[PDB]
Design a protein around this nucleic acid. Structure first.
Ligand SMILES: [Zn+2]
Ligand SMILES: [Zn+2]
Lengths: 853, 73, 186, 186
RNA sequence: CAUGCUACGCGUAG
RNA sequence: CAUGCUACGCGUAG
RNA sequence: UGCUACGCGUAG
RNA sequence: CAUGCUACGCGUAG
């Protein structure tokens, strides 16, 4: 029957499901040459390739192989599969333990593989190792494709094997046995000294014991890396090796210094789970004065706060707790939403909210209790240490960087920095003394340049404050925003603002950040996505727990892609230290929730300068990963087009048989994707126009492929109920940015207009977030903006959708009448009253969508 | 319909409860928030009316806080 | 705009120009009347812009003070207004249980805790007078929130046990009203 | 505007024009003095414009120096506040154990997370439910981080004192969970 | 009068 | 000296 | 009481 | 606040 096979020859190359005298003599000779090795092979029904295929190409419909694997090795019982959402990670996390039952079975295999390699190294046999040729027990029964050479000089090709096995190591937690004394599940844990933070020798030992024959140089500390391609390679192994070490060793490295005679406690390094130990280079002891820059550096540093605070043990959450900066725990609650009775009565008088009507209120202000805010932080357990396919990742990072070749980036001075709003919070402990304007006016441009130069050589740990957002939603769950300190913003901006403004000012690209939907912009984007597609079909999906469950490797990759624009302004060490700062201030940071410090396991903070753009790069990377996984999962012998066959062959070559970047094939793959896979990505929202035939024959990415990639990378389960697929371009996308698309006729031209959900607009109009917004006579502009946003509803075939705009117009007119009456009662009528007329005419709202301006 | 104005009445009820310094009590405030969120995210008028009765009884529990006789008339 | 001193001059210049062009004068007359009306219009637009800026400043000040007054008036009268709106919408809802509990809180029958929706739970409520008692209570059946409850236990003010048989019009003066009655939902 | 040099020439030209118009001279001298007066008025307008401009930039510089003084004042205030807070948190930490753990380290650098684990005398534990209370903070004294902590105070979610006897299985629903227990090291 | 800026406010989006 | 056209500068209004 | 984008409004 | 346009007045040169 169908069995997993990783085949590679001149005809077919790929890892997919296949059906299944002199060569036999060669096999017997190779076996006789490798008979003494215990790792050489009974045989099991399933091999390693089958497990890798089941865990990386997971489908809710076909789980027979994975179920049989879990039941055969006593991982779980059959009735466990009767539980609903047993495969999901968000729902029923107990499956994380089930897969752990395979970890040892995987770990025990790795050693055998090494032994097998040793055997070849003892016989001088050059060959390639494949997953389909090693059973799940660990024995190797393959004795083909092995050429004889001088005994003692043979080299193995272990790229594809370990590469494809990387995700299974972190998914099954195979290295857990390394956390025990003498490596034994029955023996107790290893008691490491709390004063020990350098595990470099341990990482070298683990690498020499597990990945011994990996010919690429591995650096435990990312400070000694050649380029970003080496930083990512080192982080891929550091993520796996950090699981064994205790979590108390990681974090900022503190030390005692002397300032004018008094002992201070300052951070002089950082232990990243992915970058290793990073020591600051500008540490000056026995200082006699402290300036504004150093004052900010020490205030943002959590060393003093953690040393002054008392110990904390929080049982509500599973994340690590640092200390409690206050003697009393603070509980933050959300206030109930306000209700505008005037607009509600005006709408009810016009026949709205009647029984059986398709238009009803679905969005309100949801309140929360005191233990809800921290409960949101309790979601951060969805972030698990995930190891990614390193070669596939090094290819996808390049393919994604090719999407950002049209923009320009670099470092700008403080005089060129633009801040949207200055009267906003500056984080902890900077919010206790003033807003961001305070520190932006106190520090001159020279001080900001000095701080930037200091961050270019040293890393500063920061504290980010997570607070609840008071906004409209349709779910009872609350939303939290993590405001970072100003020391992080003034650096992230200075570093990435040129690229951020170049991306926002570019039109007609994949990333549609900065493109307005008014004045015919939506039509422009829609026609840009339809750029020459043979059989166009639209698709869209979502990312469950994106900001929470996204691994750290992809965030580091996105940061590297964003920093690759500094080829002439920043050096190697400067870029590495900027990446370390970004990881210490966004990736692995210190969260001050309820007056208590906690260690964030990972994920993307939502208060960073590179927030939307990081998510956009992540989306492009996931899309390219799905494309590569879909194209390489095909048989390759049933395709009638030679071009795609040779392209898949070269893809496999550049992935698992090549190490250097092949720019020619990168160009070819980028052109292929732009031709058969047009993308419109805005942060986490994505709309793809793909050739339907190529998706049917498995030449491009599909829904199941995105689901599998999210399963084995993002460690989340993407249900098909939330993903939409459209077969007719005339109707347009189903939903993009909470906006639906409709093809209308404007000036003898057929153009696409975006209309929102009437329920959201009516909820915004009826329920406000403050008391003055209810009946403060300032709501005129609010309702004008709501009508501007909801105008395209007047062309909907449903009359209930079109009546909302007329209701808003009449309400604006009534509000103007009441305002005029009140002004006449208090004093006299205004002279410029006629100017208000345009606000109750439909022409002012119709001109907002004309492509003239 | 009764669902819409029942949801609005529950919203105003929770607003008045929060204004009456009920949030000082963790258990009572959490129960009121749960009831209000269940009223908002509901599709049956009967359960919504029962939860509205519960929240109105919560409001009526405090006698000295609100003057029913003078305010209702 | 007739109140401005330059309005008379502008009107006179315009009338003179019209009468001169209607009479067919020489070209020098056309030039001098053009100059006159041009300087008159310059002065007129000067004064008009000045007056319009004055009135615009006044209008902005008036709308700003009106905004501030409305803001402070809404900040001041929030509690009473919100509670009146709440009770108005409550009366507009017109439900049996709602109106029943409103009347029971009006006459004096207010509960001690939340009216439970579970099939089996304890509901405790005070009764001040025997009139409301006989109106709401009937033996071991309690009509509350348009629902029937099985009367369980009764306590007086001094926390002494009293049976249902002792509650009567003859023994009401001997009772320490109000009475806290706890019951179970049927 | 008397301080302008061209203002005196313009005034003299206007006086000469008035004197000549009061005498009724020939048209030639009248138009000549008109042209001269117009030149003088143009120069007067130019010098008045540059005077308004220099006054405007003077006001702008005054506002700029006022803003700079405000910035310096706020910077001094922020520096004072930051230094005060830093010195307070410096005197707040415990040195007896910090110096010990620093001199015990050979490299001199230690992780941050171990600082409050081994050098803090007070421990605040937040317990959500009674099961976790019995599993962790059982009795008057408990063990955590290889240290014996004696319970000093227990507070509810409403910032109220809760006795040790009040924490029971039958009284768990009436308690305001979670409970924050502060215990000093012993 | 047009355009673009600056200041303040408001609305939507991720 | 008067009338007209062109280039330049200043002020005013839109 | 976060980051970014767009869009209105009122002043310079 | 700046730039440009339109209209008006003034002055210089052809
Ligand atoms: Zn490296
Ligand atoms: Zn640079």
């Amino acid at each position: 029957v169908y069995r997993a096979f990783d085949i590679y020859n001149d005809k077919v190359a790929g890892f997919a499901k296949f059906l299944k005298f002199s060569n036999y003599q060669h096999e017997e000779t190779i076996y006789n040459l490798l008979k003494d090795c215990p790792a050489v092979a009974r045989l099991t029904k399933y091999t390693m390739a089958d497990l890798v295929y089941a865990l990386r190409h997971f489908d809710e419909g076909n789980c027979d192989t994975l179920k049989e694997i879990l039941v055969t090795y006593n991982c779980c019982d059959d009735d466990y599969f009767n539980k609903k959402d047993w495969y999901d990670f968000v729902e029923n996390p107990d499956i994380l333990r089930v897969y752990a039952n395979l970890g040892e079975r995987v770990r025990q295999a790795l050693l055998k593989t090494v032994q097998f390699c040793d055997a070849m190294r003892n016989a001088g046999i050059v060959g390639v190792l494949t997953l389909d040729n090693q059973d799940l027990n660990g024995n190797w029964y393959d004795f083909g494709d092995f050429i004889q050479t001088t005994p003692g000089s043979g080299v193995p090709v272990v790229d594809s094997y370990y590469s494809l096995l990387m995700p299974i190591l972190t998914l099954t937690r195979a290295l857990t046995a390394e956390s025990h004394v003498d490596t034994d599940l029955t023996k107790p844990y290893i008691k490491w000294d709390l004063l020990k933070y350098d595990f470099t020798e341990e990482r070298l030992k683990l690498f020499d014991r597990y990945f011994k024959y990996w010919d690429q140089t591995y650096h435990p500390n990312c400070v000694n890396c050649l380029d970003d391609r080496c930083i990512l390679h080192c982080a891929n192994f550091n993520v796996l090796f950090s699981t064994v070490f205790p979590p108390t060793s990681f974090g900022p490295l503190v030390r005692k210094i002397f300032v004018d005679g008094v002992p201070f406690v300052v951070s002089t390094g950082y232990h990243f789970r992915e970058l290793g130990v990073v020591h600051n280079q500008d540490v000056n002891l026995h200082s006699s004065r402290l300036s504004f820059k150093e004052l900010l550096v020490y205030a943002a540093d959590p060393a003093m706060h953690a040393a002054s605070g008392n110990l904390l043990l929080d049982k509500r959450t599973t994340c690590f707790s640092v200390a409690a900066l206050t003697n009393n725990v603070a509980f933050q609650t959300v206030k109930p939403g306000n209700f505008n009775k005037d607009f509600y009565d005006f709408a009810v008088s016009k026949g709205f909210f009647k029984e059986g009507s398709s238009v009803e209120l679905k969005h309100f202000f949801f309140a929360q209790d005191g233990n809800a805010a921290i409960s949101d932080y309790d979601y951060y357990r969805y972030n698990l240490p995930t190891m990614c396919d390193i070669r596939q990742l090094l290819f996808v990072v390049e393919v994604v960087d090719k999407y950002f070749d049209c923009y320009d980036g670099g470092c700008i001075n403080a005089n060129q920095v633009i801040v949207n709003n200055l009267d906003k919070s500056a984080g902890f402990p900077f919010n206790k003394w003033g807003k961001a304007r305070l520190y932006y006016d106190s520090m001159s441009y020279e001080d900001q340049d000095a701080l930037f130069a200091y961050t270019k050589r040293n890393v500063i740990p920061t504290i980010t404050q997570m607070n609840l957002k008071y906004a409209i939603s349709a779910k009872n769950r609350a939303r939290t925003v993590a405001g970072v300190s100003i020391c992080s913003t003034m650096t992230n901006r200075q570093f990435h603002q040129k690229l951020l403004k170049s991306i926002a000012a570019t039109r007609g690209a994949t990333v549609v950040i900065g493109t307005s939907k008014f004045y015919g912009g939506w039509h422009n984007m829609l026609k840009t996505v339809y750029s020459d597609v043979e059989n166009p079909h639209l698709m869209g999906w979502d990312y469950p727990k994106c900001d929470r469950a996204m691994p750290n490797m992809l965030r580091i990759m996105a940061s590297l892609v964003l920093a690759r624009k500094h080829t002439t302004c920043c050096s190697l060490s400067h870029r590495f230290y900027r990446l370390a700062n970004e990881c210490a201030q966004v990736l692995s940071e210190m969260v001050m929730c309820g007056g208590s410090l906690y260690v964030k396991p990972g994920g993307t903070s939502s208060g960073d300068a590179t927030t939307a753009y990081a998510n956009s790069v992540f989306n492009i990377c996931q899309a390219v990963t799905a494309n590569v996984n879909a194209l390489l999962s095909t048989d390759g012998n049933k395709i009638a087009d030679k071009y795609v066959r040779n392209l898949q062959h070269r893809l496999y070559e550049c992935l698992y048989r090549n190490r250097d970047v092949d720019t020619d094939f990168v160009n070819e793959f980028y052109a292929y994707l732009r031709k058969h896979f047009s993308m419109m990505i805005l942060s986490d929202d994505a709309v793809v126009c793909f050739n339907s035939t190529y998706a049917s024959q498995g030449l491009v990415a599909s829904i199941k492929n995105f689901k599998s990639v999210l399963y084995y990378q993002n460690n989340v389960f993407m249900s098909e109920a939330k993903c939409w697929t459209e077969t007719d371009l005339t109707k347009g996308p189903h939903e993009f940015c909470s906006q639906h698309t409709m093809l209308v006729k404007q000036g003898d031209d057929y153009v696409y207009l975006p209309y929102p959900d009437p329920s959201r607009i009516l909820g915004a109009g009826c329920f406000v977030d403050d008391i003055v917004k209810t009946d403060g006579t300032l709501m005129i502009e609010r309702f004008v903006s709501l009508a501007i946003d909801a105008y395209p509803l007047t062309k909907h075939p449903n009359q209930e959708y079109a009546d909302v705009f007329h209701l808003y117009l009449q309400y604006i007119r009534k509000l103007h009448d009441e305002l005029t009456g009140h002004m006449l009662d208090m004093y006299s009528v205004m002279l410029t009253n006629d100017n208000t007329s345009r606000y109750w005419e439909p022409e002012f709202y119709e001109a907002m969508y004309t492509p003239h301006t | 319909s009764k669902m819409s104005d029942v949801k609005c009445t529950s919203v105003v009820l929770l607003s008045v409860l929060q204004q009456l310094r009920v949030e000082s009590s963790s258990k009572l405030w959490a129960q009121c928030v749960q009831l209000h969120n269940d009223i908002l995210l509901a599709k049956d008028t009967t359960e919504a009316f029962e939860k509205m009765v519960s929240l109105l009884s919560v409001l009526l529990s405090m006698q000295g806080a609100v003057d029913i006789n003078k305010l209702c008339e | 705009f007739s109140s401005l001193p330059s309005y008379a001059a502008f009107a006179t210049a315009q009338e003179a120009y019209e009468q001169a062009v209607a009479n067919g004068d020489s070209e020098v007359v056309l030039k001098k009347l053009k100059k006159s009306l041009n300087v008159a219009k310059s002065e007129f637009d000067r004064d008009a812009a000045m007056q319009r800026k004055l009135e615009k400043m006044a209008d902005q000040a008036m709308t700003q003070m009106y905004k501030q007054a409305r803001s402070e008036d809404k900040r001041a009268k929030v509690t009473s207004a919100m509670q009146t709106m709440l009770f108005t919408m409550l009366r507009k809802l017109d439900n049996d249980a709602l109106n029943n509990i409103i009347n029971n809180a009006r006459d004096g029958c207010v509960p001690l805790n939340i009216i439970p929706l579970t099939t089996a739970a304890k509901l405790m409520v005070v009764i001040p007078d025997y009139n409301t008692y006989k109106n709401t209570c009937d033996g071991t059946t309690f009509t509350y929130a348009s629902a029937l409850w099985e009367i369980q236990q009764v306590v007086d003010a001094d926390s002494k046990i009293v049976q249902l048989s002792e509650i009567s019009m003859d023994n009401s003066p001997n009772l320490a009203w109000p009475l806290i009655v706890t019951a179970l939902r049927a």
